Coordinates of N, CA and C and ligand atoms in Angstrom, one line a residue:
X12 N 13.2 21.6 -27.5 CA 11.7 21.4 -27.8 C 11.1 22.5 -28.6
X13 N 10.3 22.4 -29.7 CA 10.2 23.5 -30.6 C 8.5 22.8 -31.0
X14 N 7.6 23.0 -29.4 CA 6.3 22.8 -29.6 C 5.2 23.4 -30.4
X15 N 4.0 22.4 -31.2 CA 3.5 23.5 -31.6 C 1.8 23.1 -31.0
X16 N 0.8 23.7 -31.4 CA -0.9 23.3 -31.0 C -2.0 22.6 -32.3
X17 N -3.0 22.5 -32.3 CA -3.9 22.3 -32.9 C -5.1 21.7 -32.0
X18 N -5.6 21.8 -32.7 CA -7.1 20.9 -32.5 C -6.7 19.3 -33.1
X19 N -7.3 19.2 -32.6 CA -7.2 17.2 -32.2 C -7.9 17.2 -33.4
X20 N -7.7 15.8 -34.0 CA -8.5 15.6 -35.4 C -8.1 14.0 -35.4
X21 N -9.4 13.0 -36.1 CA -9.4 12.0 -36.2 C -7.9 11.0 -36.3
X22 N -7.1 11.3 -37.1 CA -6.3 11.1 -37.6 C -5.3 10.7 -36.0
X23 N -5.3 11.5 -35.4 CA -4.4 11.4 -33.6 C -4.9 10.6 -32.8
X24 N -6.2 10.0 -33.2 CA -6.5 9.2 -31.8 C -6.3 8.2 -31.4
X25 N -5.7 7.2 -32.4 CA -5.1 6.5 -32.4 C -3.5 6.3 -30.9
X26 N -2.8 7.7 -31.6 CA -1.7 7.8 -31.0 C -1.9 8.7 -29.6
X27 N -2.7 9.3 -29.1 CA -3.3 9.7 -27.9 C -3.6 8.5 -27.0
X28 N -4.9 7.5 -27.6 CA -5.5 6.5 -26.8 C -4.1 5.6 -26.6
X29 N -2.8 5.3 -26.8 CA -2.4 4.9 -26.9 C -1.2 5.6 -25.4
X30 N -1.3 6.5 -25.3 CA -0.9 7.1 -23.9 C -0.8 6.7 -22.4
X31 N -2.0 6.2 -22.0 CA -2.0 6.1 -20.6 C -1.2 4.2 -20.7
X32 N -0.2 4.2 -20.2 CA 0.9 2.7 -19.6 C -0.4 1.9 -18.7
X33 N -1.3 2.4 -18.4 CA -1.8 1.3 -17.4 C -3.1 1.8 -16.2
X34 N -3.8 1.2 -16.0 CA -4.8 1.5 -15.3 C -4.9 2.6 -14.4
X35 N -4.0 2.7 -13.4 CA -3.8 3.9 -12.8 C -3.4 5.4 -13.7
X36 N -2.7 5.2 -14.8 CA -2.5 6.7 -15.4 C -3.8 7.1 -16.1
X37 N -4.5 5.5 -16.4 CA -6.1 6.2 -17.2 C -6.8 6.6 -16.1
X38 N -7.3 6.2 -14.8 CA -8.0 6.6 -13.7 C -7.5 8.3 -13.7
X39 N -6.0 8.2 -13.6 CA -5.9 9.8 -13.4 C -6.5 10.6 -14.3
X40 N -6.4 10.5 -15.5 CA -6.8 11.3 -16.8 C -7.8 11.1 -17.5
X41 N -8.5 10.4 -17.0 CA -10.1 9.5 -16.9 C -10.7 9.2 -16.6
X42 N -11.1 9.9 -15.6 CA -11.7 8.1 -14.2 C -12.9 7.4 -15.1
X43 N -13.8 8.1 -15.5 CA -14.7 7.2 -16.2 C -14.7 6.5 -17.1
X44 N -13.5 6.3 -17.6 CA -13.2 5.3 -18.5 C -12.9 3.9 -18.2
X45 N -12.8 3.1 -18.9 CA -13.0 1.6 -18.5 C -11.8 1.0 -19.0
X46 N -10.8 0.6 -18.3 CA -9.3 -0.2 -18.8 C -9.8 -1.2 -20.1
X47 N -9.2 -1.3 -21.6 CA -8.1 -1.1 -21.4 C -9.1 0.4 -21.9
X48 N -8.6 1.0 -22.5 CA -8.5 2.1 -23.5 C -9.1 1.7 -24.8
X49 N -9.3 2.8 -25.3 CA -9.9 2.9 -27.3 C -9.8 3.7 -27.4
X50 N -9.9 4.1 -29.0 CA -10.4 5.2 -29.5 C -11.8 5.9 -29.4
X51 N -12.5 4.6 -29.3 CA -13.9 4.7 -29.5 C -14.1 5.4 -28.1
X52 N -13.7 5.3 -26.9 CA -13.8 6.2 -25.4 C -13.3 7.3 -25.8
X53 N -12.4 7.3 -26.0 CA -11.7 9.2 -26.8 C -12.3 9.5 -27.2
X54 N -13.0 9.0 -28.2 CA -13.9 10.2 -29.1 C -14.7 10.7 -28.8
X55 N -15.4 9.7 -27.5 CA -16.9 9.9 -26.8 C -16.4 11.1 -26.0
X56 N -15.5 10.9 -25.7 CA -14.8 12.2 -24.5 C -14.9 13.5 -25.5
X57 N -13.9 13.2 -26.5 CA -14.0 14.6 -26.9 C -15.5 14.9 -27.9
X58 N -16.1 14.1 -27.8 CA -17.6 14.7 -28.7 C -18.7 15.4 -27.7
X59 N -18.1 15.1 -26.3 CA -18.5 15.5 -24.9 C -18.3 16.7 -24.3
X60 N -16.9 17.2 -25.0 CA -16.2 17.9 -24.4 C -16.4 19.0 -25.0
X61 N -15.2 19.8 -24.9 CA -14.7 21.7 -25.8 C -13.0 21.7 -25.6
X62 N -12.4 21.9 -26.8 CA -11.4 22.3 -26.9 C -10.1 21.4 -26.9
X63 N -10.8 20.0 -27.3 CA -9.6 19.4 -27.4 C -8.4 19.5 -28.6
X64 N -6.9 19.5 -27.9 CA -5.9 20.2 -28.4 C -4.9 18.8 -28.2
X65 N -3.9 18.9 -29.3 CA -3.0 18.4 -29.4 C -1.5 19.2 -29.4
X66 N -0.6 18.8 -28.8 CA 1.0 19.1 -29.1 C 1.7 18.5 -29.4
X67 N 2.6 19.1 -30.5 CA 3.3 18.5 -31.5 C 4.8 18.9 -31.7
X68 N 6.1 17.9 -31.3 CA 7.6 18.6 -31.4 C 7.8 17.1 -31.9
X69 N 8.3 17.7 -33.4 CA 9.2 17.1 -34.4 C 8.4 16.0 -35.0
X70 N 7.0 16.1 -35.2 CA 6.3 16.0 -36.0 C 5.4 14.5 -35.5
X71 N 5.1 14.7 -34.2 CA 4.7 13.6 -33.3 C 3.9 14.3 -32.7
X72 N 2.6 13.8 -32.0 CA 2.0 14.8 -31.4 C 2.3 13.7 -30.2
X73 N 2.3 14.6 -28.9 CA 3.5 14.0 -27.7 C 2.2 14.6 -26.4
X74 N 1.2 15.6 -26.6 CA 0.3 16.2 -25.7 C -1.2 15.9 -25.8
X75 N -1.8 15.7 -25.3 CA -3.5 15.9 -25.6 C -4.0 17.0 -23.9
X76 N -5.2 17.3 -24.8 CA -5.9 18.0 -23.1 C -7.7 18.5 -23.6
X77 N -8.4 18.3 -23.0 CA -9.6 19.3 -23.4 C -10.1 20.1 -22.2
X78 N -11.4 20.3 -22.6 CA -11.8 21.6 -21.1 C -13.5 20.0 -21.3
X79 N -12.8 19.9 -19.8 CA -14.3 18.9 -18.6 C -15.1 20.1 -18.5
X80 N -15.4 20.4 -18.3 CA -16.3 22.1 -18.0 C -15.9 23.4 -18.6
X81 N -16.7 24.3 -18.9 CA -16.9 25.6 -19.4 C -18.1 26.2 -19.0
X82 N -17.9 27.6 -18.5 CA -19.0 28.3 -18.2 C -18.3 29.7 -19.0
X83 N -19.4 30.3 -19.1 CA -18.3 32.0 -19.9 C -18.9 32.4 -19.4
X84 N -17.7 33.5 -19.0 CA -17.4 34.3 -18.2 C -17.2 33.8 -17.0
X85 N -16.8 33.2 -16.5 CA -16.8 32.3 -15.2 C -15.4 31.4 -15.1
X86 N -15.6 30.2 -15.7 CA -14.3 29.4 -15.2 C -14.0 28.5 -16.6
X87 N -13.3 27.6 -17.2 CA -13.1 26.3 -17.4 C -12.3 25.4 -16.4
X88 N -12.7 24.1 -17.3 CA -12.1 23.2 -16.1 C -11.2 21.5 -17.0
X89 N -10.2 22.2 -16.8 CA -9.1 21.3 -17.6 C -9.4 19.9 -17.3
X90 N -9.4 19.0 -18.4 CA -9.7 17.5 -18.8 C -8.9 16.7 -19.4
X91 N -8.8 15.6 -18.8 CA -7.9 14.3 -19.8 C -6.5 15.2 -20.5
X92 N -5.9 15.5 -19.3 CA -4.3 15.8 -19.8 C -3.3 14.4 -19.9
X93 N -3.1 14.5 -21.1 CA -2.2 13.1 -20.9 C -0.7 13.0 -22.1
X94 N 0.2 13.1 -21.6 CA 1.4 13.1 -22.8 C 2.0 11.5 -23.1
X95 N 2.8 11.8 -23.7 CA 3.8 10.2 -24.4 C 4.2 10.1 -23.7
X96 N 4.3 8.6 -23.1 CA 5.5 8.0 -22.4 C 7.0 8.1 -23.0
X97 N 7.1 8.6 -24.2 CA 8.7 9.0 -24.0 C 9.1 10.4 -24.2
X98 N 8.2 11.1 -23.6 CA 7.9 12.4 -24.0 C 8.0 13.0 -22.9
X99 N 7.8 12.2 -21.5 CA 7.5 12.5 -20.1 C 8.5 13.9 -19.5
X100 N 8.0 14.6 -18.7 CA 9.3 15.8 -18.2 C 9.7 16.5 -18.9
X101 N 9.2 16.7 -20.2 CA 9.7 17.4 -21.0 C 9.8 19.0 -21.6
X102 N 7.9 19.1 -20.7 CA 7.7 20.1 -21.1 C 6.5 20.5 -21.4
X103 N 5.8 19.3 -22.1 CA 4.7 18.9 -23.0 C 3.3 19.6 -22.1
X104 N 3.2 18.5 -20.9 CA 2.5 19.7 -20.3 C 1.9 20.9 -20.0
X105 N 3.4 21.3 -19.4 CA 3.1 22.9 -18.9 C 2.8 23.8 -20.3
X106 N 3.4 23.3 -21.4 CA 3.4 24.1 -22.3 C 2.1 23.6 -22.9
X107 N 1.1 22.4 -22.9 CA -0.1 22.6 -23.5 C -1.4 23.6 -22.6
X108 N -1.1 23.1 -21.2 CA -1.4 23.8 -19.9 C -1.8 25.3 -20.0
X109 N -0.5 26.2 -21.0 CA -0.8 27.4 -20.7 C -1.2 27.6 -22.0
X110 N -1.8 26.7 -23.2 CA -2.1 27.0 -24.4 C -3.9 27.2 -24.2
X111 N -4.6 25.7 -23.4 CA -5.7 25.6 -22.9 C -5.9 27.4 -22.2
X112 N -5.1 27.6 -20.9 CA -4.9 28.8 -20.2 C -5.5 29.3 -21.4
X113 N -5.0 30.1 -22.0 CA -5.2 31.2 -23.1 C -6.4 30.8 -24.1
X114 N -7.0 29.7 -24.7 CA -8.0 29.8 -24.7 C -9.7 29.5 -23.9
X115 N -9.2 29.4 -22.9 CA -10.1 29.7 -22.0 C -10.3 31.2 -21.8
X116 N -8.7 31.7 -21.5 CA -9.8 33.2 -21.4 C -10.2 34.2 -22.8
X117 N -9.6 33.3 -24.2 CA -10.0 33.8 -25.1 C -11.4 33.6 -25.9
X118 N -11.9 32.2 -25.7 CA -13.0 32.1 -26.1 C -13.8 32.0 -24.7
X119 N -13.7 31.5 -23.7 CA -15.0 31.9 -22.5 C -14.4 32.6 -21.7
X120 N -13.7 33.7 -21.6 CA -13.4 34.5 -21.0 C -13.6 34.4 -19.5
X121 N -13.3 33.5 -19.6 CA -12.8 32.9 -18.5 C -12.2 33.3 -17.3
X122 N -12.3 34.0 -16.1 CA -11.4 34.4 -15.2 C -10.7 33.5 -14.2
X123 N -10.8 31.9 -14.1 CA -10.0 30.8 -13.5 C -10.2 29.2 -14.3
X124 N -9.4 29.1 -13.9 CA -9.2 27.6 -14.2 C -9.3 26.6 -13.3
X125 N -10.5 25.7 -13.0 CA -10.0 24.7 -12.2 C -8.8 23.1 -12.8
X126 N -8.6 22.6 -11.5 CA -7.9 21.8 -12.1 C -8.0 20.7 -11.0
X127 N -8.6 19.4 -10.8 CA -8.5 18.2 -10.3 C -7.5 17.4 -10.2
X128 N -7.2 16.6 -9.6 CA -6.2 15.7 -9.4 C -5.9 15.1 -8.8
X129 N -5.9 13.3 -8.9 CA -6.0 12.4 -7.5 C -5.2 12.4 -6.8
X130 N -5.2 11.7 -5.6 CA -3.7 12.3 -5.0 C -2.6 11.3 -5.2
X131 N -2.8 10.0 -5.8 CA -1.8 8.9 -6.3 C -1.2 10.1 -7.0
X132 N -1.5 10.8 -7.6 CA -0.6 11.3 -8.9 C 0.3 12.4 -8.7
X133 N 1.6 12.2 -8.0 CA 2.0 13.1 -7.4 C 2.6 14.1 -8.6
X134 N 2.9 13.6 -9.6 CA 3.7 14.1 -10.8 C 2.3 15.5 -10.9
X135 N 1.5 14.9 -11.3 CA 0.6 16.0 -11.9 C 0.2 17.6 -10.4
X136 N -0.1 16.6 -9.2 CA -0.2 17.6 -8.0 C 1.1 18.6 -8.3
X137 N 2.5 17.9 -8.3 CA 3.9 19.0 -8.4 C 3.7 19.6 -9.6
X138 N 3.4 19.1 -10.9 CA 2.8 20.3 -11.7 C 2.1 21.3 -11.9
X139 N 0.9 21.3 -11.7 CA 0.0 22.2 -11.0 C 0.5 23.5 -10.2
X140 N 0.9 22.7 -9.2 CA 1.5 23.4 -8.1 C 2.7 24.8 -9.1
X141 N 3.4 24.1 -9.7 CA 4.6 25.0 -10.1 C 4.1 26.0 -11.1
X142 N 2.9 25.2 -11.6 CA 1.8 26.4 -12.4 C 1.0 27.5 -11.7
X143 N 1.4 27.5 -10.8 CA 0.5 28.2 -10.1 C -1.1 28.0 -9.3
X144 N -1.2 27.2 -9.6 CA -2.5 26.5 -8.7 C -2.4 26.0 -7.7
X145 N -3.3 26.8 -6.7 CA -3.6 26.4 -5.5 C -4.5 25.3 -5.1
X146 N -4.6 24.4 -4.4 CA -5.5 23.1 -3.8 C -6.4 24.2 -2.8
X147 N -7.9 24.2 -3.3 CA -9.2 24.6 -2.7 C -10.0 23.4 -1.8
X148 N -10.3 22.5 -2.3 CA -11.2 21.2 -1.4 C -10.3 19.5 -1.9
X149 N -10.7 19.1 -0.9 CA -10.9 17.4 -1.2 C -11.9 16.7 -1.3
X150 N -12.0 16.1 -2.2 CA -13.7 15.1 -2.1 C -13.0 13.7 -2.3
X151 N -13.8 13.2 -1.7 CA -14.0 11.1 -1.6 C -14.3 11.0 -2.8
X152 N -13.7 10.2 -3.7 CA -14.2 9.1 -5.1 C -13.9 7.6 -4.7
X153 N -14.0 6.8 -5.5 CA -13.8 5.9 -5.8 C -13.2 5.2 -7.0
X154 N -11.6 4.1 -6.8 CA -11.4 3.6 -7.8 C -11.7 2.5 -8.4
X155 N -11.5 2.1 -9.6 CA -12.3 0.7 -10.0 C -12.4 -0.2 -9.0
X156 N -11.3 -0.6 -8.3 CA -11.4 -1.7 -7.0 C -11.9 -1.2 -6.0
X157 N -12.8 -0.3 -6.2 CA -13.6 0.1 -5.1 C -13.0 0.7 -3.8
X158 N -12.3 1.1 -3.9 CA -11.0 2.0 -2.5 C -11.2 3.4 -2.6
X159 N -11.1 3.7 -1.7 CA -11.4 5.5 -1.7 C -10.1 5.7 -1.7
X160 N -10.3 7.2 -2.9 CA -9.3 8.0 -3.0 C -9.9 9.3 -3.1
X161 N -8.8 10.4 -3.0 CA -8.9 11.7 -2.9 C -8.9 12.8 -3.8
X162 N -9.4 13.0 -4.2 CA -9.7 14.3 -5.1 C -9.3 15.6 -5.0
X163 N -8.1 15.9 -5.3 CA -7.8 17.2 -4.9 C -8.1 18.5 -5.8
X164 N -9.2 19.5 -5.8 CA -9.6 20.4 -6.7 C -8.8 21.6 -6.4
X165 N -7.8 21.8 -7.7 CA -7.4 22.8 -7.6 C -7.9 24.7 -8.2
X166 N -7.4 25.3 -8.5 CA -7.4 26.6 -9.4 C -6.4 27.3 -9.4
X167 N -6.9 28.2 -10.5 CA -5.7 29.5 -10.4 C -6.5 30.4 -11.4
X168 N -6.3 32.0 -11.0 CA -6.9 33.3 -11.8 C -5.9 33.0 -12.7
X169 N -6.6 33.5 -13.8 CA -6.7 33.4 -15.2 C -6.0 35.0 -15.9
X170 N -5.9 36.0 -15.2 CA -5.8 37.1 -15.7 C -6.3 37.9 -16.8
Ligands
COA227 C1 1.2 14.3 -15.5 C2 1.6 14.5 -16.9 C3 0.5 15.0 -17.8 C4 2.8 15.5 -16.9 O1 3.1 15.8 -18.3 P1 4.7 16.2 -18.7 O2 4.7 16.9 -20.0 O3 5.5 15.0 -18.4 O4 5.0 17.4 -17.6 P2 5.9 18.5 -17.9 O5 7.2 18.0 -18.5 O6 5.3 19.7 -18.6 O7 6.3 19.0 -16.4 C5 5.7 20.1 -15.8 C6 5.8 19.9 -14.3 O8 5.0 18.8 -13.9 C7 5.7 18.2 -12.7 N1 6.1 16.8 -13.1 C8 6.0 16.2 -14.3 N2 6.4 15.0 -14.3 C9 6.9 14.7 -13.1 C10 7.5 13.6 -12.4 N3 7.7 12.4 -13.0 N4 7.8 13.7 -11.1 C11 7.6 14.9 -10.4 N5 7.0 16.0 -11.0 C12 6.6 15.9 -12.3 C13 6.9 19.0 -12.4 O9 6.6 19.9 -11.4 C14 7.2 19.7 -13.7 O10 7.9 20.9 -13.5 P3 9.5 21.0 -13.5 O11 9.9 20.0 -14.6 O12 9.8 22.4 -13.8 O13 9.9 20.5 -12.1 C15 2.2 13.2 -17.5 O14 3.0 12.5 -16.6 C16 1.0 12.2 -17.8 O15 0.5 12.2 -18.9 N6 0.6 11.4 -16.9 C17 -0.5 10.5 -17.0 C18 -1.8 11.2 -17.3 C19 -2.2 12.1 -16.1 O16 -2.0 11.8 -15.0 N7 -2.8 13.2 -16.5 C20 -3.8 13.9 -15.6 C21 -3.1 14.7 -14.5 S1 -4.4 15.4 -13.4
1VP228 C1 -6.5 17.9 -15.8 C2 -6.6 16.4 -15.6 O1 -6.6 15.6 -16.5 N1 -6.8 16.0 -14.3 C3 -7.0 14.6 -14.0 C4 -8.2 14.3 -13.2 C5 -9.5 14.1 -14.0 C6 -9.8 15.4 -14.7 C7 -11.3 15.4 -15.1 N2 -12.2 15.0 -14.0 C8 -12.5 15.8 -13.0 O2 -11.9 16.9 -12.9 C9 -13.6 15.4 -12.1 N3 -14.3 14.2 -12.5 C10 -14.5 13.1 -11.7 O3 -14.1 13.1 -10.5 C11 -15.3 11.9 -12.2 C12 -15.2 10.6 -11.4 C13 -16.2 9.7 -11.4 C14 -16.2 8.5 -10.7 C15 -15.0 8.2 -9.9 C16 -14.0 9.1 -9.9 C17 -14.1 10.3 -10.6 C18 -11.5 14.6 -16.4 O4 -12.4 13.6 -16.3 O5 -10.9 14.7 -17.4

């Protein structure tokens, strides 16, 4: 794997929106999005957002992620992580994970990161976790079929 970064740019949304397999992977990396998917929701996300980033090995961009909140000096709060289905385990992740990391504390100087995550999603909970983020609270949401699920809010200092 010989990843690299950027800023997201029109031209990827296409191949990003094209990411989540199915209702449950968008709920995780979206809840407020509305099945199926578009571009036209991506872009509302990222025209909403700060810092959305793309990752790219062998000339595919295989990562997306932005920051759901920012405060400077204070915290960000990691948004809409989502890689390629044949990209999965690879790496993609952790390694966009600690790109966001770094500019969080480079442009809002940031001293933590939060990080949410439902509890269907065990992949992302064991990632987190091996990043170093600890589970702080649970809160009740709701999924499209109206069932409660769990919200698990994580963090980790930022150094
Ligand atoms: C969750 C997701 C972002 C992980 O991306 P990824 O690039 O496949 O993950 P990475 O390869 O960087 O793996 C990093 C860690 O995540 C965890 N992880 C990733 N995929 C996993 C799986 N299928 N099963 C268990 N743990 C998994 C592991 O702890 C892994 O560390 P390890 O490989 O050293 O054990 C990806 O599966 C995805 O896009 N899912 C749908 C969108 C989503 O749920 N995003 C929001 C999460 S809150
Ligand atoms: C890093 C990553 O991609 N994690 C996946 C979970 C969602 C991350 C983030 N939301 C939040 O952190 C919190 N927002 C919410 O809970 C919004 C919500 C509204 C209605 C029903 C359920 C949920 C987001 O919207 O990107």
């Amino acid at each position: 794997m010989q990843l690299s970064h950027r800023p997201a740019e029109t031209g990827d949304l296409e191949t990003v929106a094209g990411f989540p397999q199915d209702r449950d992977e968008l709920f995780y990396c979206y809840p407020k999005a509305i099945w199926p998917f578009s571009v036209a929701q991506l872009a509302a996300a990222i025209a909403e957002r700060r810092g959305s980033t793309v990752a790219v090995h062998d000339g595919q961009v295989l990562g997306f992620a932005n920051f759901y909140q920012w405060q400077h000096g204070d915290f960000c709060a990691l948004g809409n992580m989502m890689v390629a289905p044949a990209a999965r385990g690879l790496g993609v992740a952790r390694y966009l994970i600690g790109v966001m990391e770094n500019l969080a504390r480079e442009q809002y100087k940031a001293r933590l990161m939060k990080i949410s995550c439902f509890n269907a999603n065990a992949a992302g909970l064991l990632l987190y976790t091996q990043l170093g983020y600890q589970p702080r609270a649970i809160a009740e949401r709701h999924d499209p079929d109206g069932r409660r699920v769990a919200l698990i809010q994580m963090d980790k200092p930022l150094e």
